[model samples]
Target chain A: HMRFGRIATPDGMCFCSIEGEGDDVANLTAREIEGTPFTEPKFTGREWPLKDVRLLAPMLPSKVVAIGRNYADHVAEVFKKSAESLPPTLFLKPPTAVTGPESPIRIPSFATKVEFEGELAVVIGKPCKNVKADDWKSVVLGFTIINDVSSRDLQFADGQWARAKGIDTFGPIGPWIETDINSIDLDNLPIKARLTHDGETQLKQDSNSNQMIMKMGEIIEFITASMTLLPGDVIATGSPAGTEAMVDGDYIEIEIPGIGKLGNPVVDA
Target chain B: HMRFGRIATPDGMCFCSIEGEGDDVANLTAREIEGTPFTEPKFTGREWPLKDVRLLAPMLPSKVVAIGRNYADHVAEVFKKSAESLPPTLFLKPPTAVTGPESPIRIPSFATKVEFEGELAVVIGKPCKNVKADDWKSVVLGFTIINDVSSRDLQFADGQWARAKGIDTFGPIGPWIETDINSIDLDNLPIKARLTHDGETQLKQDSNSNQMIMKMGEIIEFITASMTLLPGDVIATGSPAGTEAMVDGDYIEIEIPGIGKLGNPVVDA
Candidate 1:
């Protein structure tokens, strides 16, 4: 399987193809490319140990189109409403909210009761609109993981989720992007989240993509019917149940078995 | 006072300073600039008659932070709630939704009851966050007019306003940006909207900025408290009362006294 990501090297930030086995930093190597990941990359002939290069979000989306209540359990737990009643709705998290792997999620004092939602994210490869549900793979570049950090208090109070989920550093994405779409099984992908609080780690969320009421194809179709998604735009497929509040000094990690793990530390703004 | 705008000329799309008075196309000229309007532009020593250049949206914002329910009359008419109870909240319209002056607002079949909400728009001059209310002017670029189009059917059906308000071609902004903030008085500036349908023209919305519950500075302060505002980013400062739907073949115009007029025709997709 091939993976593409952006990195901060001594020279500058550029896209690279990552090669390695498992999560072993020592075995991994990041080879710099001359063009963006969206285009066919020509090797710049520069390579560095993955550990030496700082990882950034794979792509800076023009917009992040998010689906809510796509997981039935999440709908019942978060909204206390049945999936049939609420269905899946769309919202946006601005690009400014994006932070890279291991970045800190700053919680503003006003945003009391911040929560973490681990979700599988789709990266768009081409500009598209009104995509047919079954043709989702044609426009998809790959997949990554996102920690859809949210402020519960602000969400319920404001009635609009933009500010609640879109505050700076509220979207921690990456590790990297897995570009082999065939390697993934949409119906049975394992998704898990771990939280480290008070120096102790605990599994907070454990679910399968099978639990999602709407599949990636349908989700993409729903969003593109309304707005045109540009190349490198992101789609945060809804999170499964098991979201809880996070406080200062907390560390959260979301892992999708076929993709990669995305982790971030929590801190006060 | 200087007005900056982007235009499509035979040479290419470039930012230019618009010069002339009123709506006199023959008397106006668009002087080509070497840099973006966000920077101090250097004249490229080339000029074109305004009538020959096609006006584009002045700025392509990374995000469009929109304030909702900011006008008491709008909240009451649209939401059937008092401004105090509903309050102003934030939402977003993706940049893809933005179309320039004299463009067409395409209405998809699903969005049956499409309506227009014209309002004053603010363009941020610098990247800023946590801006104090009184210090809003420091980050301000100038002003423009926006037709915040909405799909009433989708709006009420979808709880989140993103898709309802963010469909492609839904946000029509410009003529140009009036960069002299002091030239127009925000407190008493007049806002007007006209709709021409079936050969009949009528004033649909006639209001003053004084009628707004949240002034520009307060709105800026409220937004920056949550997320950062970047250069060329736009803030749609909520619509005044009297928004109504229009069918295909309708032309709507939004006018702010100091800023120029923004007009767009309606068409079914």
Candidate 2:
């Protein structure tokens, strides 16, 4: 298992994919890191110590395709009733909404109910379409973390979710992209998010990917059948049950074991 | 007036802003052509006859903001009812859907009613937030053409229009961008679309920009109020009346005399 990301070096910025896990991530060229860093990668030995460099959101995906109400519990929270009969739907967050590691997630002043939904984000490794469920895993580069930051008050009030869910810097990911995805079962991965208000823990969520109505394969296949998923494009696996609002000066930490933790501070607009 | 585009030449692919737009569009240096064909510009003397190159979409927009049901007449035609009380809404077309001038607009096999929506596309010249309606013009780089190619069948069946309206090659914009937008009153510019089937004009509609219920400034102001619009981003103004189904071999030509024609031939996927 290993991680990769865009980082600042003394020279400038470059893309680097880590070859393996802890204490051994070193020196890789931004280019020549062949075949979407998620798949079978044959790396070149360009050496740099992982601890010395700063990391980015891995990459700014051209499109962030997100699912709504994929988890029954989260759906119940929003609708105040079971969503068993409703089919899951899709929405988008423009590329401009993205920000990287350690970036602040600003709460929009227009909404009184701003919150974060932590989920696993899949990065597409290549251009593909009409992908059947069986072949969905082959095109994925790897998995990472994303905070599906939302303004709940506006999200339900509007006819469209674009503005409520896609404010700039609202989506944040990456301390790193863990390519050893074999570590987590596709349908059974455990997910957790811890919310802190004014430096105190406010809430914790423990859920399983298996609880998602549609698995990863179906999600990819469904989205790809419509538009081609390009390299670096993202599909945000829906967050699980525990969801809550944010206040200015609050912080949250979302984690997926065997992957990593993604944290962000909240500030008033 | 001048046009700019990314051209594939024997030397390599480069961006050129036309020096003069007559029988002879010539002598422009790509490097001197400056910025990303999407950003600010400056051009130098490097010559090429306009006929000697292949044109790509003027710029690959990071996000495409499309206004839905903004033209009252067209909205009425599609709904067969008044939409006065329902505010116009916005949707997105992923960047992967972009194709250049002369590229084929392939009708998805799953779609039964494919269509072409011709309208003025605004090219944002710079990044700004909360742009006052009065100051919208300064943020616009110029005007161009876009065929917001769509699939009516799936669009009406789904809540999220991402896939229904955003398949591969579904977005065709540009022969080149006409950067002389200051000459026209944005609210009153003329727009038209001609659909030709098997060499015959199948449908022709003439409409003025004033016919758009909400003007460009309001559209930009409405959208930028939510997220930051970056340079090279596109806002597809709503289509006028006369939009209908497109056949497998039909050709749609969208033109705003001052801008130029954006034509695409339809094909069965």
Candidate 3:
């Protein structure tokens, strides 16, 4: 299966697609693409050893439209509200909040209690509006992992989640974009997260997409109905339960069964 | 004083600075610039009659961070709450929602009751974080006008302003960016709005920046505390009192004394 991602080379950042299992970075090979992933980019006949390059976030979205309360357990855990009553809501995480995989998730002084929310993120391939739920796949470019890191204290104090979730480096996305959507079942992919605090590793989140209240298609349809999804824009499906507070010197990793693992270190600003 | 803005020309979109009163579009001249306004764009030595080019949104921000209830009168008018009680809150409008002057403000079927909020907008000139309120202007590029078009029905129903205020074409910004911040008095500029509905034009919002609860510098400081402000990002200072609903067949115009007028026609989807 092919996966698309961006990497930092000597010249600058370049978009490329990777081949080989990639489980072993040294065995993976990257073929350079001439433009962005959403442009149906053509190869430039250039190649790179994946191990030699520094990976960046797959896409720098113009905006990140995120789903909130899409999983009943997460809703109950965070809001203590019933899924039927609160329902799935939409929010946004600004592009500036985006950080690459293995990047440091910085916590500012004011935001004391931070948490890790691992989620599946969809990358849009085209400009679309009022997209139908059944036709959602037509506009999707690929899937990636997102760490929707949040400051719990700020979330409740502000009432609005913008500042709580949108601080710089709050959105750690990537590993790579797995273009083959069919490989992972939208309703049943296992999503897991691990956190290492004080050198002790512990399972933080262990859930599956089956727990998602609104399916992928419905989430896309709902977002596009109110706003247009531009090429390279990201949609972060709501996070599942089992999210817990993370502190400085902690390392967090999120893994989707078929896609891959995205990890980040926590640090204080 | 110089004003920077985007215009649609024969070749493509261009970033340029306008000279002359611009009150008379035919008499004003536009000198083309090499790059985006956020960049230190130099004159490309080409010029065009202002009337010959079509105006676009002054700045297509990566994110439009807006203030809510930053006007005590507005807090009372809309929320029916004391400014002391409700206080100011921050939210975002996605880049896709931005539309230029004279563009159609398309009202989707879901958002039936839409209103126009006129406010002075701040365009960021540089990447900055944790800006102090007293030194806010150092990071500012200019001032402009923005119609923070919002759907009142969805606003209360959703309980979050993302969908309520972030529909495509919901953010009507421009006329142009008035780069000379020193020319206008920030605390006392006249902010006015006119709406033509059915067939007659009437004053809809007649207010002044003096009504603003949080000053521009304070708002900038508050926003930068949580998120980094990138060049071209916009901060819409909260709307004043006197905003009212506009129907489909209406034309709404927002004018900030030194910034010029931004008008758009309202149409149904």
Candidate 4:
């Protein structure tokens, strides 16, 4: 699988094709590439030491369309949301909420209950409008991960998820985008979220993407039918069960096997 | 007051400063401009007949931070949302929802009830983070118009409002951004929405910005406190009472004294 990421060199931000031998990513190499991973990309011969630069979010989306209660367990079991909730409960997190792996997820002082939700995400490669389930695979270039950080207090208080999930640094996506989705069957693979405070894992989720109440293609169809998806747009397919709040100094790690793990440090705002 | 808008000439898409004689607007001129409305801008000294070009939305926001039930009458009685509803209600519309004057507001067939919510929009010109009420006027560059289009059935059904107000061409803003916000106090000026269907006026609304339960400065203080506002970012201060659905072929015109009129025609998708 080709891993694409955005790294900041001394000059500015540059897209890269990261190459590391096996899964031992410690000693890795990056080829400075041109264009985006979504379109016809030209890899410039120039190279940079992987650790020499800082990595930013792999894809900069204009807006992040997030699903709510896609996981039946999280709904029927956790949120107490009903199954027949029409059109698939949906909400949005501003693009500003997005941050890269290793970036600090700030628990705004005003917000007392902050939760971490790890999710599998679809990275739309082109402008998709009124798309069907059959064509969803065509517009999607790859899969990625996004930690849909939330402020439960604000969410319930405001009657909308906007401010609760829209805070800066609230969305932590990446490590990178995995283009190997072309072969993997999500039905067999599971998406996991491990919440750790200090060195102890407080909560661990083990749920298959196949457990999603709304089909992935249906989610895209519902969203794209309302709004247009751009080249770098992202559709977070919601979190699995076992959602819980994390305090400052907690280590939140989301592990989605095919896509890889996304880790972020929790800090006080 | 300087007006900024995007225009399409035979040459291609170009940013231009429009000059219309009096309010008649019979014939106008556009001076080709350099740079965006945000940051330092320079006029290119080149001019074109306004009639020779087509106008597009004045600004392209990365995300539109919109408020809900800001106007008391629209709520305390309309939505019946209490004033103490926590951190001030908020929601978002994808950037794709934005269109300019005369743009067609497409009512996707999935939606049966489409409403027009004309509102005053705050246009941010610089990056603002953790801003206070005192610093709001400083961070804000000017004001503009936004016809916050809505789909009632979808909005009420999903509960999350993802599709309700975010359909393509749902947000219409422009003639241009009125940079003279310093001259008028929102307390005295009333933002009005005049709805028309098939060339005849249907509903005319007259509501004062002062009628907003959450003060404008307080709203900005609330938003910037959580998320950073970038140049070209927008904050749509909720709509007034008089909001009603628009049928196919209906015309929606929103008027704010200084910001001019933002008019959009309705069409079936």
True contacts kept of each: 0.88, 0.62, 0.77, 0.89
Model 1 / residue A176 / CA error / Å: 0.8
Give one digit per residue, the lDDT tens place, for model 1 in A219-249.
9898888899989999999899999999999
**Candidate 2 lDDT, tens digit per residue, B208-232?**
8888888888999888877888888
Q: Is candidate 3 or candidate 4 better by lDDT?
A: 3
> Model 4: what TM-score?
0.95
Q: Which 10 consecutive positions of candidate 1 chain B have the poorest summed lDDT?
A: B19-28
For each candidate, report its DockQ versus the true two-chain complex. Answer: 0.92, 0.58, 0.83, 0.85
Clashing pairs in 3: none
TM-score, each model?
A: 0.99, 0.89, 0.96, 0.95
lDDT of 1 at B80: 86
**DockQ of predicted model 2:** 0.58
How many residue pairs clash in model 3? Answer: 0
lDDT of 2 by residue, A185-233 (tens): 8667888898988667855678988888878889988888778888899
Per prediction, the TM-score for chain B is 0.98, 0.92, 0.96, 0.93
Which parts of model 4 have CA positions greater than 4 angstroms off? A81-87, B76-88
* Candidate 4 chain A least-lDDT 10 residues: A78-87
Q: Which ten residues in a row have the lowest lDDT in candidate 2 chain B?
A: B23-32
TM-score of chain A of each: 0.97, 0.88, 0.96, 0.93
Each model's lDDT: 0.91, 0.78, 0.89, 0.81
Q: Rank the candidates by lDDT, best first.
A: 1, 3, 4, 2
lDDT string, candidate 3, A24-112, tens digits? 66788878999878666699999888888888999889999999888898988888887788888789999999999789999989996
Ranking by TM-score: 1, 3, 4, 2
